């Protein structure tokens, strides 16, 4: 997260970390047993970490659980980045408590002007590298469809939308992928892509979660 602030340690019980060698992507806890992330974050083996605040320090609250199933959207396209969403089934159900909890799925699509919360352990610099140990947050508004398309001519598909600032300075960055965009108590976005980070007229592009609610429900039931 570039231009954000450090989250209260409680705060975002739905935020998860994906871990192969090390932390490489974020994700969102949508039930005991399922996590939403991005299809581009796909690995063959993944360990999910819940109740993290400082990923380099054992704090006593965390839950380490291996993925039993990793499922990319069947229509994900690696050239266009269309349908950049992925489901992960935990090999054991997470224990839901004060530090580890679910986030509602959307019941309406994102509305322009709405302030949202974006979070993750992503790079905090537009040029150069500075990866945080502690979770970062960012308040940012959903942008108009026109603002999104004018920023990325030829490239915004139906699965995409923009959140952030056209002037730059605040945005999500590398290692934030897969992570949550929450608006008024509902997961609206998955961190996906952008041209650089926090650059002028290049707001972050997010996967529109609302578009996949049926696919999520059905996939979960198919793999119970």
């Amino acid at each position: 997260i570039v231009g954000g602030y450090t989250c209260e340690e409680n705060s975002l019980p739905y935020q998860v970390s994906l871990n192969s060698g090390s932390h490489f992507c974020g994700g969102s806890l949508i039930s005991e047993q399922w996590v939403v992330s991005a299809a581009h974050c796909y690995k063959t083996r993944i360990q999910v970490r819940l109740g993290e605040h400082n990923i380099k320090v054992l704090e006593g609250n965390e839950q380490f659980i291996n993925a039993a199933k990793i499922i990319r959207h069947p229509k994900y396209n690696r050239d266009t980045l269309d349908n950049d969403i992925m489901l992960i089934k935990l090999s054991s159900p997470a224990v839901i408590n004060a530090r580890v909890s679910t986030i509602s799925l959307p019941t309406a699509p994102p509305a322009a002007g709405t302030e949202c919360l974006i979070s993750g352990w992503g790079n905090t610099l537009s040029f150069g590298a500075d990866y945080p140990d502690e979770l970062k947050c960012l308040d940012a508004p959903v942008l108009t469809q026109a603002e999104c398309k004018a920023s990325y001519p030829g490239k915004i598909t139906n699965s995409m939308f923009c959140v952030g600032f056209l002037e730059g300075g605040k945005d999500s960055c590398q290692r934030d992928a897969g992570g949550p965009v929450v608006c008024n108590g509902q997961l609206q976005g998955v961190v996906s892509w952008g041209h650089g980070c926090a650059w002028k007229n290049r707001p972050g592009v997010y996967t529109k979660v609302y578009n996949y609610v049926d696919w999520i429900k059905d996939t979960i039931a198919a793999n119970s």
Binding site: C25, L81, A177
Partner: protein, 57 residues
């Protein structure tokens, strides 16, 4: 060609460790790939990068 291409993280926002050939160093070095896009100066392991690029393997 591909061996002189700049290390490109790409547009996606994951963090994946890879290798590219650095012409100034005349050898391979680590970089963080973003998960998509970029170019072919992008190798899974050091050995493989040095295999394809530079020197006289």
């Amino acid at each position: 060609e591909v061996c002189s291409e700049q290390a490109e993280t790409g547009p996606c926002k994951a963090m994946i460790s890879r290798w590219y050939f650095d012409v100034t160093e005349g050898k391979c070095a680590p970089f963080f790939y973003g998960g998509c896009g970029g170019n072919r100066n992008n190798f899974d392991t050091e050995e493989y990068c040095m295999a394809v690029c530079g020197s006289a393997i």
